[PDB]
């Protein structure tokens, strides 16, 4: 059963552990293959948005960082949320091989946008990765085209609906590939008011078919091209959570943490900027 695989000792699965057990994000994945109309990807030591990091690390330096934080804080997960996409940077794999031997105790976890899941799902299973998160914001191309601008696949660029149809085929087939390989898939969905508002439930039924075990509906952080957009009301994100919960289990404590965040997602720290700022 796919249910016997999904268990909770990870804080981003089961909210009763979120403010209890740690996790570490290594900022080792800077490049990205797609363009989300709400992504901004930055480098600073303040904002808490997911595409933010204080400094990028090398795979070997990330090992030393995990080792150092393990001793000082209570860690249980190692995740590559990385500025861009964790499947699009070979250093994520380079790290996951090194961490498979150096840290056999902490469970491995990583975030992706599915586009490279068909090509790299085989590798993921070989690295002993436990959970992977896929960011699915739409299934209907009429919705999806309004969310993504460009997609890079097979050394070529895609635009509009053509770009979305490549992404949708890869993410959904990527969930089903991962589910078969034994990897527990989580699906993050950003609730964009006016766009996928009345579409989130359709997404939940599609990802359930593909084998996704949990769904994390998160409100939009109006950034990128959608800076003018409104952050959905908390009363509205609970309305979609209560109907989606009837189909697939729902995570309710996502704090949209940055790609360098280490520590318990109740009292976590971030990587300091890097000394190169005088005038």
Q: Residue 275 burial (CB < 10 Å; 0-12/13-18/19+)? A: exposed
**Number of neighbours of residue 252 by Cβ within 10 angstroms:** 12
Interacting residue with ligand CLF among 14, 21, 23, 151 (CB under 6 A): 23
Least distance CB 256 / ligand H2S (angstroms): 8
Residue 85 binding: pick among ligand CLF, ligand H2S, ligand SF4, none (C-beta 5-8 Å cut-off by kind): ligand SF4
Both structure tokens of 171: 């993410």
Nearest to 263 by CA among 29, 18, 89, 8: 18
Q: Are strands 156-159 and 148-153 parallel, antiparallel or unpaired?
A: antiparallel
The verdict on whether residue 234 carries a ligand-binding annotation is no
Least distance CB 158 / ligand CLF (angstroms): 26
Both structure tokens of 28: 């080792």
Rule CB under 6 A: is residue 34 a binding residue for ligand SF4? Answer: yes
Order of all β-strands in the sheet with 184-191 = 22-25, 75-80, 107-112, 131-135, 184-191, 214-219
Both structure tokens of 239: 């309305």
- For 8, list phi and psi in degrees, rounded to 5: -120, 115
Which CB atom, from 147 or from 244, has the smaller least distance to ligand SF4?
A: 147
Q: Which residue is nearest to ligand SF4 (CB)?
A: 39
The verdict on whether residue 32 carries a ligand-binding annotation is yes
Distances (CA, A) of 126 to 97, 130, 152, 175, 228: 9, 11, 25, 17, 43
Which CB atom, from 129 or from 138, has the smaller least distance to ligand CLF?
A: 129
Interacting residue with ligand H2S among 188, 189, 196, 213 (CB under 6 A): 188
Which CB atom, from 76 or from 188, has the smaller least distance to ligand H2S?
A: 188
Binding site residue list for [4Fe-4S] cluster: 12, 32, 36, 39, 109, 254, 257
Q: Give contact residues for ligand SF4 (rule: CB under 6 A).
A: 32, 34-36, 39, 41, 51, 84-85, 113, 135
Q: Give contact residues for ligand CLF (rule: CB under 6 A).
A: 12, 23, 25, 50, 77, 79, 81, 109-111, 133, 216, 254-257, 265
């Amino acid at each position: 059963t796919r249910f016997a695989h999904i268990t909770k000792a990870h804080p981003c699965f089961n909210e009763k552990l979120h403010d209890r057990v740690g996790r570490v994000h290594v900022p080792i994945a800077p490049r990205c293959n797609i363009h989300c109309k709400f992504c901004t990807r930055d480098i600073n030591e303040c904002e808490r948005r997911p595409g933010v990091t204080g400094r990028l690390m090398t795979a070997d330096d990330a090992i030393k960082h995990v080792e150092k934080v393990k001793e000082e804080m209570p860690i249980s997960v190692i995740g590559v949320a990385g500025p861009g996409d964790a499947l699009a940077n070979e250093e994520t794999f380079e790290f996951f091989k090194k961490a498979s031997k150096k840290f056999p105790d902490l469970l491995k976890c990583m975030s992706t946008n599915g586009l490279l899941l068909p090509d790299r799902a085989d590798e993921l299973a070989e690295l002993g990765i436990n959970t992977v998160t896929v960011t699915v914001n739409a299934v209907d191309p009429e919705i999806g085209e309004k969310i993504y601008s460009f997609v890079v696949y097979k050394d070529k660029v895609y635009h509009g609906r053509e770009a979305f149809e490549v992404l949708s085929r890869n993410q959904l087939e990527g969930i089903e590939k991962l589910a078969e390989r034994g990897i527990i898939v989580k699906v993050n969905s950003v609730l964009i008011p006016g766009l996928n508002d009345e579409h989130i439930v359709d997404i939940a039924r599609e990802v359930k078919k593909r084998g996704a075990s949990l769904m994390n509906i998160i409100p939009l952080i109006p950034m990128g091209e959608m800076k003018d957009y409104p952050r959905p009301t908390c009363e509205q994100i609970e309305r979609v959570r209560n109907e989606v919960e009837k189909i697939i289990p729902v995570f309710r404590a996502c704090t949209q943490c940055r790609a360098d965040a280490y520590g318990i997602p109740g009292k976590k720290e971030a990587d300091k900027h890097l000394d190169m700022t005088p005038a």
